Symmetry: C2
Subunit: 404 residues, 2 copies
């Protein structure tokens, strides 16, 4: 509920590869890294419980199904394989509770989202995180990733991004827990990595963009994709994510840091903004907001025999829902039948979850957080009729239950 | 151009099960009305039920691809010919909604589950081919929180004016499917309210706006938990004229109330299509004047879908093993055009960019073949690597 500030950093895979190759000493990379140093230190001094981390995925975990604002509600996240094998980094913790509250506040504000769990984080996240946070063992904070689909046009308008960040700030502030949150916008600055125009940069624009983002960001809310792409290269237009981050911070900020290095394709830039706190008192109170978000499911617990599928539920049943969901894969459900045990022993499912499947325990699976449709798959596969599943739910014999 | 109205219906999978009865008879007036008006495209609002949409689960997933085959739900591919999509239409829809500040997702290639195909089979003749084209909208009503009722309404409202801005003479049927009232899970599995059912099917048509305050708690208490999915009817409803029912239905053979509604478009605005087509085009207008740049818009996503999808697989360890050691076998098993295989065989970087491969797939390929991004960029610029590095402030390599 305390926003301490935000930072902005390029996320080019070259940062990661300079890190993994220990080019910290390298004549070329040494000074780049030194540019990371004040952000690294601030983060180490300020000790945020959570970083709300805005990035875009590069056709790795998001491709055949591609969304604008995909909020990560998961328990942990590991490096995505981008074709060369997973980088060697421990997994980093998510924050389902913060993510839930944020989703609720953002939906209330008529932002349409996507939720996701379990998928790799690509260079968009881990490239700069690996240089800004000690990871030799685990990570110093949790993360709530927000993947933004800036690659497949049409994409949301720059002003839409800013507005998301304006709602995001109130979402986090109203989070009724006493923690520190930092916000990260990532990507940029100028570059283009495709076409005969590959190699384009524009330091003049990068320098102008950073200054305006710091001191007059509402001035940018009119730029089209064409304006951004002309000035900052095609892929440089991803800087709408910095806009998002900046929107979440106070109207006015202190810029503690700025650095810029253009060694090859990408202008590798970082900024660190210290929140100044709400200039005014806020329009809607942390109380009216929390209730506004709580609204759509107000009273729902009065409904009995009923286990609503909320993020918390989805997160709690993920391991076993993911498992049961694979029953659409032919060799999988075939293994599910002929050799259920070696498959169980193949899984990350707990003994409890395995027990629930073996026991074909239907109402306890719903209890535990399995969504019905995954039972619908299991039942379909085992030759059980749906009716039997509703019989076992109701605690009745099929004929007993068939009273209608 | 214009819309012919739109039908409402249950996507219950029993409607599918059954086909291998004043119920199939409930589908008649629809079934004929589909041949009558003869729709160019059907805009189909449904929800996937944790089959194709699970680990990444979005609110409004617009199908942009060219065709759709039935999803394996654990029981196997349901023998059915693919149905065609409308990428051009879908693009425009995307453009117009985004300008309206609706946040979307785009998807191609994934199967369609019973929530789509069950009804379509008893709705339109599949024997040989489908009688129209589809633009699916898959709404995440299963994982909470979900968009507000009013929200679903307004998306419908924009959908209308979007579809009315499409530069064509074509007629569109706007489907919207689900429910009606039921709960498929829990001790309270089996719940029903037909009194609520009728109050709903009736309030939708005559007094749609009056539903726009209902919450998830209300929809669940009255219609059962899964019954709340009926907000997908509101969305459908929003896409039509402010104000005739050509048919209705009902019966309760099992858990799910099976309802139908056949609406005829009676016509209506505040922004001229000269202003609306231009406003949609605004974000990317002028962009053709930026040389050496191939924006990745949906038309491009669709044209390059097969080969993007293929190179995408390079993230799987085994696939990229095959790619290196035995590429020809891989091509043979693929759905690639020989043109596409050629681009890949030729390691023709600029060509793939021109053809619609997105760079990040090329990045995967390059790395897999043990070659750097730099070799790729250099190739883009028709330069040798050292000559490309002359343009960099500092030369470096990496994959
Ligand atoms: Fe990026
Ligand atoms: Fe459904």
């Amino acid at each position: 509920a305390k926003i301490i500030g935000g930072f902005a950093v390029s996320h080019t895979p070259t940062i990661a590869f300079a890190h993994d190759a220990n080019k910290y000493d390298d004549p070329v990379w040494a000074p780049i890294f030194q540019g990371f140093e004040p952000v690294k230190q601030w983060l180490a001094e300020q000790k945020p419980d959570v970083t709300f981390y805005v990035y875009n995925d590069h056709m790795t975990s998001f491709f055949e199904h591609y969304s604008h604002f995909a909020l990560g509600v998961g328990e942990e996240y590991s490096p995505a394989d981008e074709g060369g094998g997973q980088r060697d980094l421990p997994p980093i913790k998510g924050d389902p509770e913060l993510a839930k509250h944020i989703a609720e506040c953002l939906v209330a504000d008529e932002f349409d989202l996507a939720y996701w769990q379990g998928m790799g984080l690509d260079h968009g996240a881990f490239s700069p995180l690996s240089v800004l946070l000690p990871h030799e063992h685990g990570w110093p904070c949790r993360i709530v990733p927000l993947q933004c689909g800036v690659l497949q046009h049409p994409i949301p308008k720059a002003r839409r991004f800013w507005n998301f960040g304006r709602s995001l700030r109130r979402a986090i502030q109203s989070y009724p827990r006493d923690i520190k949150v930092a916000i990260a916008g990532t990507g940029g600055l100028s570059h283009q990595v495709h076409g005969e125009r590959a190699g384009f940069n524009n330091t003049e624009w990068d320098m102008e963009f950073m200054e305006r983002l710091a001191n007059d960001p509402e001035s940018l809310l009119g730029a089209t994709v064409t304006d951004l792409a002309k000035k900052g290269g095609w892929e440089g237009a991803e800087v709408v994510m910095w806009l998002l981050m900046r929107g979440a911070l106070s109207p006015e900020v202190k810029t503690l840091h700025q650095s810029y290095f253009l060694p090859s394709m990408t202008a590798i830039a970082t900024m660190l903004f210290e929140d100044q706190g709400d200039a005014a008192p806020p329009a809607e109170s942390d109380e009216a907001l929390r209730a506004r978000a709580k609204r759509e499911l107000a009273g729902v617990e009065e409904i009995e025999g009923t286990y609503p599928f909320t993020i918390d539920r989805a997160v709690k049943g993920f391991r076993i829902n993911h498992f049961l969901h694979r029953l659409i894969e032919p060799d999988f459900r075939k293994r599910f039948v002929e050799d259920p045990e070696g498959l169980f022993a193949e899984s990350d499912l707990t003994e409890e979850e395995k027990s629930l499947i073996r026991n074909r325990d239907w109402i306890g699976m719903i209890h535990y957080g399995v969504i019905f449709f995954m039972l619908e798959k299991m039942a379909a596969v085992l030759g059980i009729g749906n009716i039997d599943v509703y019989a076992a739910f109701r605690g009745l014999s099929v004929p007993e239950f068939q009273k209608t």
